Point group: C2
Chain length 336, copies 2
Amino acid sequence: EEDELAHRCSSFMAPPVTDLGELRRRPGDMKTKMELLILETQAQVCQALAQVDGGANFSVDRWERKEGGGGISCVLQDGCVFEKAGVSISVVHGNLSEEAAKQMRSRGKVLKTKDGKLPFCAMGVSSVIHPKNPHAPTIHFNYRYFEVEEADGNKQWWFGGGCDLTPTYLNQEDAVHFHRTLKEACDQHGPDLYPKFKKWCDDYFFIAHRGERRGIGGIFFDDLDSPSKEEVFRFVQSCARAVVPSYIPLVKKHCDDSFTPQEKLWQQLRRGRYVEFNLLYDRGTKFGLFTPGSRIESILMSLPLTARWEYMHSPSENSKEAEILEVLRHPRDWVR
Amino acid sequence: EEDELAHRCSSFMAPPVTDLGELRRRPGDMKTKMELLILETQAQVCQALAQVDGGANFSVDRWERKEGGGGISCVLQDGCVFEKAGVSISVVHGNLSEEAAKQMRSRGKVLKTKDGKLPFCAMGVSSVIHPKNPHAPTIHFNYRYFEVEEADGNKQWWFGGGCDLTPTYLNQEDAVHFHRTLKEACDQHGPDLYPKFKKWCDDYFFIAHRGERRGIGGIFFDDLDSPSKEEVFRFVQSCARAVVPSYIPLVKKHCDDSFTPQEKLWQQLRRGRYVEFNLLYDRGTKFGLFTPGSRIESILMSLPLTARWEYMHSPSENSKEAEILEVLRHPRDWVR
């Protein structure tokens, strides 16, 4: 019979960033469990996307750097269903830079150095998928884990993540399906998680000057460090496993929908909004792998194939354009 | 005979931000001279653009806010020559916020409060113009002035500005024309200004991760506070007056050039680079009206009508695509 770990690894997009000998020695370490989870998630998502899109192949770049860890970047471009799809993982080990350390103190985190250093590990998966068809929505997700070794055998750790949808026009069934899938995943771990993280997602992706959100939300969480490491991992695992069922059915349903040049135009304006969230409010932080805010590499991976920016006459009062603008300004409940 | 100031004002896009009664009382104040210069420049540029583009009209929005000063924003969109053109002016009076003050100290500026306050005035013009034709280049320019009243009758003041070109493909004649026009303007005020500011421009618009500049540069200067206020103003005035001759001839020459769908595609990728400079390296600073870095309003005004982002096969070794990439990576002299 095939070795359990070997079997898992044959299904990944590329070999793990961490030496397989190390993962084999420490199967129960959260760093091991989380690296395998992010690799699994990346593979599950890429496989689902590749099954849907016959028009392009993933390029898979497993990379490493001396100071910047390693990762696996999977990119699909200009396919028949997806104009852009990126699914990346990163794993970084090292000692925290004085700058990184300083920033955490500003957010109220107190780190006690071990020797003179702060050994740490940060890892995560992050993805942005932009369909070609105006009626097939964009998705973003990310799931990550951080630990830092302090004085004594004490460790400080936390998880972060989220999954959010950016439709061109509102589709009620799609919105409910997406949110319901996320809520079911969260509810397994406690009834207050989805409502909290749904609200957090509505608040976080706010393009402030327009008074509009990027999309229809989903879930967002950060600094998640209770009740226990294993319990939070199981929650994150449920969330990561919800991505494909939350999303691929929407793309399969809508990828062939007819659309007008005007609907395509509107899609392009909505894609410009997606980009603008970064331009104005999330331009790049070097420490983005373990705090809210994106690293440059992530921002680049998120860009669509094309976008449009143009000052727009208020749309007809009962138009689909007006409807989506209203919900971006005033988010709604989708599941209770 | 028409009143000199009234005659000047009839040529502006809208009335000055500052009460005309105040400008009339203090004709010799640098705030007056600079406000008139920025209004003149805005009008000269808009008039030149409107003469070239019969396909769209400028919308002119003269606005004010209680805490945020006032301005005049002129916008043209989706014309027959320009896909986007923005020419804005802002004039803000008030007392420096503790945050703004703090930032200046970080840059090594030392301000001595008058009473408990730092009364200040900041003003400027800023513009981004994106032609439709791949062969007609994008331009950006800005010219600004800041003063703050300190303890005693002492004032701290400085100017900043620049003018830079972002071609889709390199055209040697265009590059020389543009740079020559700027150099002639600078040289009138001293022989070391153009070489210094040309290099500064090459260094500033560096999209670091690609190792490429946004375009072919021009001039860039900041914190310009010597030799005297009148001398620096006259220099800035020469630079502002060089915009139209540096640029409009290039648009008139190339706006009708034939282009291929591939050249249009490349233009779209170059426009994506333009946007990416903000996304990564210049995302927004609230204090951008008096320091390097753009305010959100400026970033928005700069966005093109459309852009593209796509990971690209290295172009043919002697292609025009390869040539522009090489010069973006390794800037050249254009005039000596």
